[PDB]
Amino acid sequence: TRPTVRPRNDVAHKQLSAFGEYVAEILPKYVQQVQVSCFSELEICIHPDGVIPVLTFLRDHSNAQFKSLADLTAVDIPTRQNRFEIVYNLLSLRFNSRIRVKTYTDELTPVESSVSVYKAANWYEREIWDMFGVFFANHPDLRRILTDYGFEGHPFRKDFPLSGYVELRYDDEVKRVVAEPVELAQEFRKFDLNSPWEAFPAYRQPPE
């Protein structure tokens, strides 16, 4: 208990609980889950038709400033009707608190493209388009950054395998570097390590 166990502080837990119920009171149009972890960071789980209202609210209003933007990743969870998750990760400058706006989406329907209100979101948005495929309507510039120009597939899905379909080599028949389907030298032997016996008891989902 006292040694080697990272102690939690319930003060931040209670204050973020009050702040979360406050947000769910004042924006009832879009709020679904307001969850607080044990390490006391706020997680607000949101429908993707209030991205512009929630961010235009949470940038201002003088109960929570939150100027700073960070990570946006649309973490691909299958077995859902909506695969991808846009995760905005917002930081204050006056208050020292971190909130995670997790809004959901699918492969095709656009989110509202936050670049009009957070200027940092431009290359983050271009990266999420080039790696996942979440189109951003009413956005100025969608190009490819971090992948090749002759490349397609949105490689950070789960449906894109670890090796590539294309692979380059030089050949002198045409004096240039050409693309061929993959012919590995070793298998990348993947080891089964999902060991049984339920290493955590508090997270048992309800069975049938």
């Binding site: 992948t147 090749d148 490689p155 670890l162 090796s163 692979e167 080599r169 030089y170 590995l184 990348f188």
Partner: peptide, 14 residues
């Protein structure tokens, strides 16, 4: 070595 968009050694190039 096991990734897209990384050339497996520069023998394939030079």
């Amino acid at each position: 070595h096991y990734s897209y968009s990384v050339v497996r050694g520069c023998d394939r190039i030079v």
